[PDB]
Design a protein around this ligand. Structure first.
Ligand SMILES: [Cl-]
Length: 114
């Protein structure tokens, strides 16, 4: 179906809030990564399409997702970036896995309703 932007926003936003409210796990994902500041110059060599919670929120607010799967894809892109760039024993890697689990429980019922 064609999705009215506000209908989408209303359905998806709670799932994004749930991730944002995961403390401390969501902390590393609330703002775009800044390799200059963080002193990790090689970040963009590894991560070709940066994504994060704030960017996803902005796209959601500005009606830039026409369909639910698009939002899901951005969520997974964010996760995959973190798993890719961070060692599997790192804090960020584990935070990422936790967010992944929270998302799964959140998104399933929502997708059905859409
Ligand atoms: Cl949107």
């Amino acid at each position: 179906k064609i999705f009215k932007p506000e209908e989408l926003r209303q359905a998806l936003m709670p799932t994004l809030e749930a991730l944002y409210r995961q403390d401390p796990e969501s902390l590393p994902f609330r703002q775009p990564v800044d390799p200059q500041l963080l002193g990790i110059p090689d970040y963009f060599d590894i991560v070709k399409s940066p994504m994060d919670l704030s960017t996803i929120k902005r796209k959601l607010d500005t009606g830039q997702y026409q369909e639910p799967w698009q939002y899901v894809d951005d969520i997974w892109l964010m996760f995959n970036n973190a798993w890719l760039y961070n060692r599997k024993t790192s804090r960020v890697y584990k935070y990422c896995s936790k967010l992944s689990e929270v998302f799964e429980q959140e998104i399933d019922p929502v997708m059905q309703s859409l």
